[PDB]
Every structure is written in structure tokens, then in C-alpha cells.
């Protein structure tokens, strides 16, 4: 898969609630995500999307979409 940044300011968003909002990702997309601790840089977590090759760009882009306006 794929380690994405994701601002852990932004990540409320992502989330949501229960982190049902991700979880409607990870249903659309048809993939995981799953927050890492921190890893990579400071204020952002990292989204580990994994499954399919191609699928974790779509996802990739799902996520990144989202946190474009939030970072």
C-alpha cells in the first residue's frame, strides 16, 4: 500500500465520528486505512492505505481531496 500524510489537525475531519467517516472511505474505496502513530513528519499522522496497487491512489485521492482545503 501506500504511506499518505495526514495533518493530525485534519484528521478530525477523516475521521469523524467512531471514525465512521473513514470507515464510508475505506467502503467507497474498497481499501484499509489505518493511522500509524505519527511517522514520516511531525504534525501529520500517516493514513496507511493497502489492498490493490491502483486502488490505494483512488483512495489516495479520496483522502487527499479532503485534506486539500484542510492543510
Do not use: W, Y
Amino acid at each position: 500500500g501506500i504511506d499518505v500524510p495526514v495533518p493530525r489537525h485534519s484528521v478530525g475531519v477523516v475521521i469523524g465520528r467512531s471514525g465512521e467517516m473513514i470507515k464510508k472511505i475505506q467502503n467507497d474505496a474498497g481499501v484499509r486505512i489505518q493511522f500509524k502513530q505519527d511517522d514520516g513528519t511531525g504534525p501529520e499522522k500517516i493514513a496507511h492505505i493497502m489492498g490493490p496497487p491502483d486502488r490505494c491512489e483512488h483512495a489516495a485521492r479520496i483522502i487527499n481531496d479532503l485534506l486539500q482545503s484542510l492543510r
